[PDB]
Each structure stands twice: as structure tokens, then as C-alpha cells.
Amino acid sequence: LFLAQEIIRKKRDGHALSDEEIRFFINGIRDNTISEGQIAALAMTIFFHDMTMPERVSLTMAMRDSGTVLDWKSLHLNGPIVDKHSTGGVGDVTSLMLGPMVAACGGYIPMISGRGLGHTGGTLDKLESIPGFDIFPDDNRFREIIKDVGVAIIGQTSSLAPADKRFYATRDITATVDSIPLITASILAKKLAEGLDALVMDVKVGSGAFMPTYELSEALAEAIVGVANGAGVRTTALLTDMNQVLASSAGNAVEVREAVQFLTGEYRNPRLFDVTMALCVEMLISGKLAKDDAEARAKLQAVLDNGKAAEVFGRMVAAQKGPTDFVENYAKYLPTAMLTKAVYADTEGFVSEMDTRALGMAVVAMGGGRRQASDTIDYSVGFTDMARLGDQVDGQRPLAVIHAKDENNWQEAAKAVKAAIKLADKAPESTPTVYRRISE
Amino acid sequence: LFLAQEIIRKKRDGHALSDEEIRFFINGIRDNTISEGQIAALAMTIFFHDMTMPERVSLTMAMRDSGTVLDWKSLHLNGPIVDKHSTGGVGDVTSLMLGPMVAACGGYIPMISGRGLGHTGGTLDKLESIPGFDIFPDDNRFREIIKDVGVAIIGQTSSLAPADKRFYATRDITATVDSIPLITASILAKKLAEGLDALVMDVKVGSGAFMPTYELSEALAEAIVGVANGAGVRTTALLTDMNQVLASSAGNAVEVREAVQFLTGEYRNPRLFDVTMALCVEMLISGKLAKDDAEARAKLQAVLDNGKAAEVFGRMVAAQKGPTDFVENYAKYLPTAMLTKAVYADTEGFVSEMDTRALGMAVVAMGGGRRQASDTIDYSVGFTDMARLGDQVDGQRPLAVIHAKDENNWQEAAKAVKAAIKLADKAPESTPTVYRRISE
């Protein structure tokens, strides 16, 4: 069709839009012929009426095509082009290990990640703690790294799924962000644009999650699986727990250290290990690198044990302009916080629950996140040695270790940490790290 | 409240907005702090959820106050400040007679009219056919005319209900125009802003009407009556027929002549007389100028018979910079069309129905209306001697007399006129001019 009003109206009256109309609208958004008021109205219409699977796929496909779509056939990489994505959380440093691990197993990961949104952290921000790390290599450089190293974690360019920038920006201030059809599209517009063969989704569940309840998480997970597979990308998704910090730390540089220590075998948080292994297993299978789940786990465990994964990580850091001896001297490069003191509970007991969102916001306020785009982040601030649910706390076991930039910064953060962690007398019932797997 | 997103969201979730929130939003629209995307979303939310009477009144009141509101207490006009409004139609020249008539009966009419929208014509455009007529006098001048003459028909200024300009403009391209709550508000934001005591609404019904069916017309009529009275303005409304041209002509100058001839007693279309008398009766009563309906009709008939009404009309035209001898020499000033030829039906029979919208569009295309704001109108083109429903047509009785600016213009218009008027063998059932009266 060719009239925005008519298309907004058609959908407004509960009619399912045609591919030709969606394509038109999206192209118009990209072309700047469609106005902000018109993006807001359609979005509010898709909210009130949702969208059928065919139109959901049309939207994602349309957004994906509004810009550049990577093609890896030229490089002739005889190995799968796979990637992972997460709905975000706190302490979710999985991507820094998952990337190298999967790459060490014969996969190729053109990970176009992002920055911290609201209470959740952003991989790109964590990586930019590494002195000299470049998240924006030229396409020709990106290709070289993916060919030589097998993995690269870069930021999104203006050329990637352009329509989405205009779209999200609008729905962000028009109350049209919580809509499975649209959420699914933003997520997939970017990932599909990477010219993937397989993809695994990490849809968080819990107090640190994006979606309010387990049902909404499950739903979103399903929408994405159907649509991603509908567009021709082998996609599987896992519902993961985010009712407490996943890794043992929360921040930027603190989480990078934890990744290196994880990769080097010095320390591996058990939950983080589960989630990380799980997402990788899915990738090895979907990417056809391994057929049996047990075969996937075996290969991955191998790369962790022999150091191949750690080596690929260092090669990546170097390849993206970072230090040539990072996994060896990471301590010499990563900025340390001024003040590092532990915070203890006002009472003894077991950690029964923690408002992970609140913990997420506490790091932002410490300066480790952005309340606004123009904000500069302090790569040193953050939490370390996070107490886990079920942990008995006392004066010889802190709730967390706070890396603050000054006393006032510490005092405030400590207050927030103590208020977000609820203690009980009896140990809480253990909830699973990985709830379920989804596929079509 | 103070957050647009939150307010859009509150309403989005079916919650009724508070006066404080509406006021905020509207003030924001006026202040330019609220974006187009945000006006579109709320509007689409008010569409899907409608609004309660209290919030409907809040919206109108808020829009009314976003700008200037006239006050007539300074002038100490010992007579009511009344006015009329119509949802528009074709051949709806009632305002040009209604104004002077009511004024001659002791009322005061600060009529802030408008221009032609879509298929309907606009009083201001008709009046601007009069050489030198000024629809934009300074407020001080407007007041003088209203004090001396009792009636003035001017165009809306930027200062009048400012929020509405931004609002309508947006909903016009976002598919959020057909919404009783919002429609009611635009209409009332302007009228209430005139500092009225009483108001009468002419809500059209039919093929030339704005609202699709009699139910929607009745509904809108009721919304307006409740809200207008809720804001403290004695308001009554009448459902009028627009299933055929109301007056005998359709255009700008052609309709001005018809008004003068009506006022002078040379010729009075029967339906137009009914509708015009009816609206005036309502105004005399609401304005307390007459208590009995029969007393209203008597007074009005009197001003028509003794020429007082015609005299007030001339005084108005002069007062607004028009000719001092218009009702006397209107022929000497009003532009005549180049080509004036009658169009006859391809067959004999009775006029059973006519697509008044189509007839409205035919005048626009002839150049007597605007398809776009930048368009200049030909004040000479139009239809005259319109055939009425039930009229037997033959070679000695044309469908209408077309005033075109050139042969090609005539040929095309004639085609449209013949295609919009449906003939039958048997005479159609006569429908009422005035369907019903509404009040609270």
C-alpha cells in the first residue's frame, strides 16, 4: 500500500497488515518520510492488537533489511556463523567466555553487542574497560578478525537495522516498548542482520529480568524462537535465572577480571558456569559443531581445560586493538577503584532474596552505568564477591565487596546493597539456573 | 502528574486520567515540551479506551484554556452572548442568516467560524467572496463590531485554543480523528473560548455528514451537549439532514447571493428555512431572549419580515471592511463565473438520492474548495438551482446549474453531478430536515 494513515488505520481496526504494507512503513521510517507521530500510533496499535506470526516475521525481516546485512560467503569460512544474545541482567558476563569457547570449537561469532540499558549492564561497556579495546572496527577489519580469530565483539553501526533506531527511540517515550511483537523485532532486526546460521537466546527470568513474570519471559522466548526460525535462522532459547547476580561481580572491569579468571580456571561461579555452558551447548548443536548434548559439553570443557578458550580471548582482545598480554597482565591494565571495602548485613541469617534490579541500579548510581547517553562511566566501581542466595551471612562473610570511587560513593552504595538483599532464618528453596529450553 | 510516558501508559492501561494530568499534557502540547509521537500515542489510547465524562470535560476545559478566552463583561452588553456551530455540510449557508437574525433579536454573536474541510464548505471562504471582507479584525475592532452590530464572523487566531492546532494536526495524520471524546474537545475548545452563555450545535446526519451513521451523529451530539453543559455553557443540539444540499446552491459567492435573497425575501429554500429557523429558536431560548418556542419563531419571523435581519447583515459586512451597499448591490461585487450552463439527467424520473459528499467534492475540484491549505479558491464556481429529492426531472428541469470557469471545468463537474444523483421511477419517502433536539 502507500498511505501511512490508511495502514495505521487498517491495523487500528484490528486488521492484519500485509508484507507490502509493513515493508512500506518500515522503509518510510528509514527514509524519514514517516513521522514520529505516525510511528507512535502504529506501535500503540500493535500493542492493543498484537500481530500474527506472518506479520511479526514481516516486521523483523523488514527492519533487518532497512540497512546492511552481513554476508560471510566471501570469506568462505568453513565453519558455522553462530551468535548469542541476552535480554540482559546484572553480572551477566557470559558473552566474554561464551564467545571464545564457541570459537575454539570451530564456530564463528560476529557478535554485535550493546551497552547497558537501565538496570542491566552492557557487554560493550565492560569490554571498553580494556585499555585500547575498539568496539568499532571497519567492516574490512571486522571480517579479518572473524576470519583469523573466529570471534569479535563490536558495537552496532548506523548502517545496522536503521529503521529500529527511529522506531525504538519513539516507542521508548510513547509507552510502546512492552510489546512482544515489537520487542522481538528489535532484537532480531540486529541479530539476523549479522547473517547468522544459528542463534541462541538467553531470556532472563526474575527480579533482574526485563519481562515481569515467568509467563511473559516464556512468551517472549517463544515469539523470538518462532520468528527467528521463520526467517530461516536455526534458533533455540533458554529461560535463565536472574533473581540474583549471575556472576560473582557486577560492574565493568570487575566483570572482565572474573571472565579471565573463569577462562583461566582460577575461579568459576557455579551458576554462571551452568548458564554459560548451556548457551554454548545450544550453539554447538545448532551450528552442527556437535550432535549430542554430551558431545557439546565435552568439547567445551576441553577448550576450557586446555586453555584454548583463554588463548582465543587474548587473541580477540589484541585483534581489537587491546593489549597483547591481557590474560597474562590483566591486572596491569584494568583500572582499580579508589576505595574497596566490604559491606556486612545488620544481622545474621540466610540470603533469602535480592532485588537484582535494585542491585543493577546501585552500580549505575555508583557511576558504573548511564542514566543518560551522555554519561561517562567509571570502569572501576562495582560489586565483587557477591553473596548468593542460601548463603549464611555473618561478620566473617560480607554481602559483597564494594569498589567505590570515594567514601560518600561507598556509603550510598552500601545502603542500597543492604536494602536489596533480604535475610531469613531458614535457607530458601533453591531455584534452577536454567529453567527450560525452547525450539520450533 | 509530570511524566508524559506515565500518563500515556496510565491511559493505555485503561486508567482514567486525572484533571491534573490532562492539564499537564495539554499545557505540554502548547508549550512544545510534549512531542508529536506522544500526542499520537495518547490519542490512539483515547481511541481504544474512550474517556469518562469528567476527563472529557477536563480535556475540553484544558484545551480551551491553553490560549485566550474572550470576556464580554467589559463591554457590559446587556444581552446574551450566544453562538452556533455546525459539523459542516454542503449548501450549509445557515450561519450567514442565523447570525443577523439572532442579533436582530437582542443576541450577541462572536462567531469564530472556519474554512472548508474536505468535502464540506467553510463559512469564512464564502464570506471572503465579498470584496474587502476581513475575517481577522484586531480584538479591539472585534469587540467594537460585536458591541455596535451585534454579530461578526471572524477566523480563528493562533491565540485561540492553541493546543488544538498541534493536537488535531497530529491526529489528522495518525488515524485518530474519529473519536467522539477528541472531536468533542476540538469543537468545544474553540467555541467555549468565545466566552459564551449559550450554544447550539448543528450535528449533520446523512451522506454529506461527517459522522457515518445516525447513531454516531446522535452520540456525538450527546457528548457535546453533556460536556458543553458540564463546562457551564447552556448547550442544546439538533440533528439535521444532510442527505442532499441544504441550500439551493453550493459554492462561495453563489451561497452568499442565496443568503441575501433569503434575507430579502426574494427566495427561501424550504429546508434551509427550517434548519435555520430551528437553530435560531434554540438560541433565542437558551439565550433567554424568548421563553416559548412559538415566541422565538415569532420574533425571528418578524426580523425577517421587517428587514431588520437584512439590515444587520449589511451593517456587519460594512463593519468588517466590506461594501457599504452590499445587500443593495451584491451583484456589482460578487464575482460571476465565466461559463454558466445547466446539466440535465440522462433520463426522466424522480431524484431518489444524492451522494452529497460527492457533490461536495465536485465543487472542490471545480476550484471552489481546497485539497491543500496552499490552494486558492475560485469564488465564482459552484452549483445553483439544485434539484431536491422528490423532484421530477426532465429536459425542462435541470439537475443543477453549473457555474464553471471553463468548458473543461464544466464538462468534468457535470459528469460528477450526474453520477452523484440517483433517479428512480417512484418518488422517495420524505425524510425530515430536523431529526431531533438534544439537551441535558
UniProtKB/Swiss-Prot annotation, chains A, B:
Keyword Calcium: no
Endpoints of the signal sequence: none
Pathway info: Pyrimidine metabolism; dTMP biosynthesis via salvage pathway; dTMP from thymine: step 1/2
Biological process annotations from GO: DNA damage response; pyrimidine nucleobase metabolic process; pyrimidine nucleoside metabolic process; thymidine metabolic process
Keyword vocabulary terms for this entry: Glycosyltransferase, Transferase
GO CC annotation terms, alphabetical: cytosol; membrane
Enzyme Commission number, as recorded: 2.4.2.4
Pfam families: Glycos_trans_3N (PF02885), Glycos_transf_3 (PF00591), PYNP_C (PF07831)
Catalytically driven reaction(s): thymidine + phosphate = 2-deoxy-alpha-D-ribose 1-phosphate + thymine
Enzyme class: transferase
MF (Gene Ontology): 1,4-alpha-oligoglucan phosphorylase activity; thymidine phosphorylase activity
Matching PANTHER family: THYMIDINE PHOSPHORYLASE (PTHR10515:SF0)
Family recorded in the similarity comment: Belongs to the thymidine/pyrimidine-nucleoside phosphorylase family.
Function: The enzymes which catalyze the reversible phosphorolysis of pyrimidine nucleosides are involved in the degradation of these compounds and in their utilization as carbon and energy sources, or in the rescue of pyrimidine bases for nucleotide synthesis.
Subunit structure: Homodimer.
Protein name in the entry: Thymidine phosphorylase
